[model samples]
Target chain A: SVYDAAAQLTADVKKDLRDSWKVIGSDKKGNGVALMTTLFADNQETIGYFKRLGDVSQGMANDKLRGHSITLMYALQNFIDQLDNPDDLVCVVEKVAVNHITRKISAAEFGKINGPIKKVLASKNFGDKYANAWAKLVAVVQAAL
Target chain B: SVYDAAAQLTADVKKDLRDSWKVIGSDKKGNGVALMTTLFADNQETIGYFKRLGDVSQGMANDKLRGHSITLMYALQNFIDQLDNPDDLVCVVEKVAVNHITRKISAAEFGKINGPIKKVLASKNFGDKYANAWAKLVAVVQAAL
Candidate 1:
């Protein structure tokens, strides 16, 4: 399932990789293709990657990634955790909120993740207060998956 | 500090204890002696006895003492932990709110300990909404603390 999807997605990734490399070109004859390939992307993926990033920044997205990025990972981790363990989303958020309050992570940074996550919630929003809660859930899931 | 308070309050406490014990004796020892001692004016003097009774009862009220009582202890413990650790109270409440809903710790029992606490909040009245909301805070603290 995932393998099939990944395999199919890999073709597009390979094309993107080739195109990017072609832009830089090779060092003559294409024999010495030592062009660097960056792993950075528009989307957050890999639970481990984001988790590590979340820990590294401690959910601080202030520098470049934006603090929202770290919390996005946090949101993602929680959703992922729920897929298996089904923990309390509110609790995780509150913990993160405390971390933010402590300046462990900046409130501004949470938006990096929350923004896109919120967009998702716009369509899937449930309760009146939780209209955007689903976006946080999805954003985190995207990060986690 | 406790020793000092015990020594200082001993006299008044003893007199109140005598009066309360007399009530208990007259009533043929009603249920919730610990609660009666803790809440009732007649049982005020024998505060230590009531404390011991509470200890013996392990701080339970009635059948409410079962899992619901544990939640109260958990709530207080969480509150204390957050005092030093610094956490988002609202988030914590949401996290644990589900358990109270699941385990059926009524908003009533949930507020037993919080009642005295809200004497400090002084803003809200003693009701189910506040209790439910507060329950979530304790729930989060349960994990963090």
Candidate 2:
């Protein structure tokens, strides 16, 4: 199910960005998977988002899940590739990110869903680096939605 | 320019959905770029919006500048092909429809800006059936912003 898959992707993303994530909200049941909405509404926030993602997912050593990480990278790369008018992609990503938070899907569950959701949603995962790639990309990426 | 292309595409779309249009609002002025917005939260609204688009651009016939049209179609188609879930595409499209209203870009201009903007921002046009099929393409194609 998509909800289940959503749960898993959230986990993987948390793992990828775990170290840098600042907990800003708590779940109804109280989980540490809280994420603070990025405060800035400019390119740096976008760059930071991608850089952190890259740092977290960078050498994904697990062969089994490495492919997923690669897929995530391509997804992000594609998002970056949209820098010519990053606004559109950024808008979409912002909604997706925000929605993920709203739903409060558990981290482990998000990881489990990451691969399946990507497979099912067929939407590629945007990697961390592309988020910080270029000034053009950063500008178009936008900040708060 | 993608804005111009989207406008031209809007005119073409007007030709397609004329029969179903109710004309809640009509053309204001400018290049006679009669831009209209319709509620599309459901099937009736969706069909209504397209129908109105059809009426507005009904006179649009020649895609003489079919090159960009062709290119846009392919890029959009590729994006559609990448979708893992049909509903995801629908969700994105629906949101874009709202975006068109929010940005106030006429249906015609939407098509014009789509390609050029994509060329500038994204490496490719979003490959989606809605985007590729001129008839199905609406102002929202450029509304993702």
Candidate 3:
């Protein structure tokens, strides 16, 4: 019963999170740059996770970072949009996970992204309840991957 | 060279007709009843062409007429949108023509529809140049039928 309540809480907060994300990204319209900026800032060694980064500038301002950030944002948006349809969403994320395996990405590396993402949202008034919900959801995704 | 001129004319006029058609259908946002009403009033015998009509009312306000009208308008709109790509448009219209053959519809019957349709467009101030372009396009479709 507690697990069900937690799952429902996560689902409820996800809708709010999606709306907040839109406002945060409105300037660039779904820009993933900030997400990438936080990610690499917290885990500089994780830069090796991206095979395409090959000597490209690692910060938020680089063109290559912006491009990859856009791609990541689109991917996250797609998953968020299909939350009510987990059967379809699971298949898509599975494909993404399998692809990352070739780059030697581990489930732990995927899990590492959750903390910086939550920190960024917290800076913009995302409270602990919402952050906890996001952390829970990302953990489920990591486990599936 | 004459045929080339006709083709050029059809392309130019199609763009105008598409714009005018959107305005006419704006009341219900592309409701097809007026087009069907004009078509049937001018050619009552054509009512027998629809397998869907059965015993349903034939006027502009009739629900049955509205349904078929929407279908017809969408078909026409699709072709108009693909005017720049005649090969793709032809494939779609050919499929429609082949389906109509099962109902004993002929190229002549297809040709008859253009007059009432043009009249409806002209009444809306669509202009003779645009109407003639539509006429030429319909003729090509009729010949294919």
Candidate 4:
């Protein structure tokens, strides 16, 4: 493999990850919204990061959540874009992971995203190949975390 | 005003529209999915156009709906992009409208989109100014129909 980081995404995994992303990211903010919404609803620990203004209690329509969803989606899009450039990708993801590290956001917490993301992708008919690739993509991010 | 078609979008409306659209379209397919999902859920008459595969009754995750959402968002993006050039905007929208007309997709059915679009935009913290402008944009589309 190119390096340990590149090993997480095989050529095939990268192909499917990028391909499924076009579909998932096409809904751009939508899939992110779904993933985050599912995360917050399914796992309350994720909500500990943002309980501001009592926005977390209900409704996916809240501004704080919507804003976070946008941020999350853009960051994920960058990760995908930089996948070919391992050095840059590692640097970028590590920095973000560090930010969360400061906030006491554990890798387990970040890892919680996998399920909700899988559900959202599958909901969009993204299928098993996409999910398997997504698992690899997440593994790479979690490695950084 | 610029013309009957351009008349629909005032300069102020255009400013807010192009601005609000950056956020809405940034989610790209997401806002489109929400709008289309909302449209399909709220109005079954609109479902008549897309009931195949037994997919019309539920969830936003289905492929047919997802594909259509991309198409809808791209078309809307183009509408916003060509807002300044009424000649092209009108010509383009008419062709789309004509196809829908051939499908017997009534202006009323097309008009059903306004509420969901408003909800999606406002949910993103887009507010009344954006909604008012969105109305103008829809008016332009409906005029073509």
Stretches > 4 Å off in candidate 1 = A1-145, B1-71, B83-87, B105-109, B112-145
lDDT of 4 by residue, B74-135 (tens): 66765675676666455446645645776787667777888897799889898887887887
Give the C-alpha miss distance for residue A99 in model 3, angstroms: 42
Shift of residue B72 alpha carbon in model 2, Å: 9.9
The docking category that best describes candidate 1 is: incorrect
lDDT of 2 by residue, A1-145 (tens): 2222223323333343322212211120011111111111112333243332333222223222222232333334334332233233443344334434554533432333233222222222434432222222222222221
- Between candidates 3 and 4, the one scoring higher on lDDT is 4
Candidate 2 chain B, poorest ten consecutive residues by summed lDDT: B24-33
Candidate that beats the other on TM-score, 2 or 4, i.e. the better one:
4
The DockQ of each candidate is 0.01, 0.02, 0.02, 0.02
Provide the overall lDDT of each model, using Cα atoms, as 2-decimal numbers: 0.32, 0.30, 0.59, 0.69
Chain B TM-score for candidate 1:
0.27
Q: Listing every candidate in turn, what is its Cα RMSD in Å to the true structure after a full C-alpha superposition?
A: 22.2, 18.8, 15.3, 19.6
Query: How many Å off is the CA of B127 in candidate 4?
Result: 32
Between candidates 1 and 2, the lDDT winner: 1
By DockQ thresholds, what CAPRI class is model 2? incorrect
| lDDT agreement of model 1 with the native | 0.32
Interface RMSD of each: 11.4, 12.3, 16.8, 15.3
Give per-residue CA lDDT, model 3, range B1-145, as digits (tens).
2223336545457767678767755542133566666667788788777545555354544444543554455456556655665544554455455447666778788777777767777777777776777777676567655
Q: Flag clash pairs in model 3.
A: none
